[PDB]
Design a protein around this ligand. Structure first.
Ligand SMILES: OCc1ccn(-c2ccc(Nc3cc4nc(OC5CCNCC5)ccc4cn3)c(F)c2)n1
Ligand SMILES: [Cl-]
Ligand SMILES: [Cl-]
Ligand SMILES: [Cl-]
Ligand SMILES: [Cl-]
Ligand SMILES: [Cl-]
Ligand SMILES: [Cl-]
Ligand SMILES: [Cl-]
Lengths: 148, 287
């Protein structure tokens, strides 16, 4: 149930998915996500942290359908992970809006926005279903736990 | 390139446009992505995600999303006006059958949203689009959210003050579909009088006084959790005996019964959109 435990399970899942990344640590995705959440809080964009057990489950639902086994660099993994995180903040976050800056690690902004729209086109139905269908939420939560 | 702008509708900024290929008339919402005021794109991406999954004749239809220049373009169906302009065009004076038609369509759109696990959270006349043929569509899902995953709280900074229910004014952490049913009641009162807001408070304190002054202050029996809400404070006990007749002169007893079911202070007692559509106000046999 712990946020720390589920973030670990997500990290271990990404290291297994992204088999080309020989020097990716399972702590690297956790560092990238914690860093964004901390920054938004200290800059006063949110009153509380976004990263909770339920929101890590939601993020993992996106990651497992979006992130290719064939991701070619740790940078590309961070870019795609932070795109899924931005969409998680946008769909499930308690604030009306979140800035781009902490989620952007690419020089080509156009590629970030194209990826946003691509993930939405793939995932918008499951993004609503994981809310509407508690059985689906439990299935995804169980799958994330079993990634460790 | 794909669309020719015809004129600005208002403010992202909204334009009447023509598809260059087909020549169909649409509404374009342009959203800048190179943020001066950070945040705007976030709300647009949430609206896209929700409207992709909300296809109903009483919900504004998102046809497409384009990414060109440093902008997102949301391509919507075009509507003739909003309910704010409609009120200004007819001296705020609706025929009782138009009152009934507009509420019926709002409840159908709202009922569809709630059945799909979506809260709108921003019902107000500016967000109700009206066509010359009498169609009404619920628009602007910029403050909308999917619900169902249990969470500590939602934002209490939802709904503009005049349309916000008493539980949210008392700082309730969580709310259900009940939030939109209160707003629907507020809009019904506007339709059924002269298109003016029923509860135009200056702040949270004034808003609660205006509500309780008309409807009566809820008792411990009616709303046992009320005194435990995070921003609860004691209000005067205003009586439950104050007539609604002059507040909604377009409505008979049947319409007033439905209005009272929408404007229940205790959110658990508020009628659902599905129940409201079954109310005798909408029967073929209504006087
Ligand atoms: O004469 C001055 C005046 C006053 C009002 N009108 C006017 C109102 C609406 C339409 N048509 C329209 C509007 C749309 N708006 C959308 O999104 C907005 C919704 C509200 N919050 C901001 C986002 C989405 C799709 C729309 C499709 N049709 C119109 F033609 C005129 N003109
Ligand atoms: Cl490598
Ligand atoms: Cl079109
Ligand atoms: Cl009609
Ligand atoms: Cl809209
Ligand atoms: Cl009281
Ligand atoms: Cl007082
Ligand atoms: Cl009440």
């Amino acid at each position: 149930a712990s946020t720390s435990e589920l973030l670990r399970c997500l990290g271990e899942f990404l290291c297994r998915r992204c088999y080309r990344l020989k020097h990716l640590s399972p702590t690297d995705p956790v560092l990238w996500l914690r860093s964004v959440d901390r920054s938004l809080l200290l800059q006063g964009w949110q009153d509380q942290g976004f990263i909770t057990p339920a929101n890590v489950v939601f993020l993992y639902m996106l990651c497992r359908d979006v992130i290719s086994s064939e991701v070619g660099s740790d940078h590309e993994l961070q870019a795609v992970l932070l795109t899924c995180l931005y969409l998680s903040y946008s769909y499930m976050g308690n604030e009306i809006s979140y800035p781009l800056k902490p989620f952007l690690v690419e020089s080509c902004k156009e590629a970030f926005w194209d990826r946003c729209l691509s993930v939405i086109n793939l995932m918008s139905s499951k993004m609503l279903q994981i809310n509407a269908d508690p059985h689906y939420f439990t299935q995804v939560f169980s799958d994330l736990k079993n990634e460790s | 390139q794909k669309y020719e702008k015809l004129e600005k509708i208002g403010e992202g900024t909204v334009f009447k446009a023509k598809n260059r290929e087909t020549h169909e008339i649409v509404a374009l919402k342009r959203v800048r992505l190179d943020d001066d005021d950070e945040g705007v794109p976030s709300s647009a991406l949430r609206e896209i995600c929700l409207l992709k999954e909300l296809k109903h004749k009483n919900i504004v239809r998102l046809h497409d999303v384009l990414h060109s220049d440093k902008k997102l373009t949301l391509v919507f169906e075009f509507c003739d006006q909003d309910l704010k302009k409609y009120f200004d065009s007819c001296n705020g004076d609706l025929d009782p059958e138009i009152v009934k038609s507009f509420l019926f369509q709002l409840l159908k759109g709202l009922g569809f949203c709630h059945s799909r696990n979506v809260l709108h959270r921003d019902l107000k006349p500016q967000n109700l689009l009206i066509n010359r043929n009498g169609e009404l569509k619920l628009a602007d899902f910029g403050l909308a959210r999917a619900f169902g995953i249990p969470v500590r709280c939602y934002s209490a900074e939802v709904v503009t003050l005049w349309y916000r229910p008493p539980d949210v004014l008392f700082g309730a952490k969580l709310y259900s579909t009940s939030i939109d049913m209160w707003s629907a009641g507020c809009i019904f009162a506007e339709l059924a009088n002269a298109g003016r807001p029923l509860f135009p408070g200056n702040d949270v304190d004034d808003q609660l006084k205006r509500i309780f002054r008309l409807l009566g202050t809820p008792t411990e029996e009616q709303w046992p959790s009320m005194t435990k809400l995070p921003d609860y404070k004691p209000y005067p006990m205003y009586p439950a005996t104050t007539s609604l007749v002059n507040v909604v002169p377009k409505l008979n007893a049947t319409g007033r019964d439905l209005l009272q079911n929408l404007l229940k202070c205790n959110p658990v007692q508020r009628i659902s959109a599905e129940e409201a559509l079954q109310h005798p106000y909408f029967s073929d046999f209504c006087p």
